[PDB]
Amino acid sequence: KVFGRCELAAAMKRHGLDNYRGYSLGNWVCAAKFESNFNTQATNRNTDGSTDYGILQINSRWWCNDGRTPGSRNLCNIPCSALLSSDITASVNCAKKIVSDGNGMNAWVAWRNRCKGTDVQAWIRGCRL
Secondary structure, X not given: OEOOHHHHHHHHHHOOOOOEOOEOHHHHXXXXXXHHOOEOOOEEEOXXXXXXXXXXXXXXXXXXXXXXXXXXXXXXXXXXXXXXXXXXXXXXXXXXXXXXXXXXXXXXXXXXXXXXXXXXHHHHOOOOO
16 A cells, blocks of 8 residues: 555554654654655565565564564564555554664664654644544
């Protein structure tokens, strides 16, 4: 599924991301925009044996299990396929786990690069929430 920004914002808000651990909703929408262009099926296969999965491009070394990645920790306790669902449950819960394990949003390279320090509220402006 390719989300729209306001639809994704509403879904992320229902799943508890607005101001989760100090990150207002627009941060999460912006991260998704630049990680995956809102595409729940986005899949980036890296040369280190890992892959980045789903709307938030969560990586298979630490976070999800794909059975092909060296050093796997599976800290979200999920198969990486769950991160390719059209429903954002697993991706949101794993994103929460990333932050609960002491990572900032700086875990997401696209957030660091396209979203940190910008007017991220623009990503939710004009959305029904």
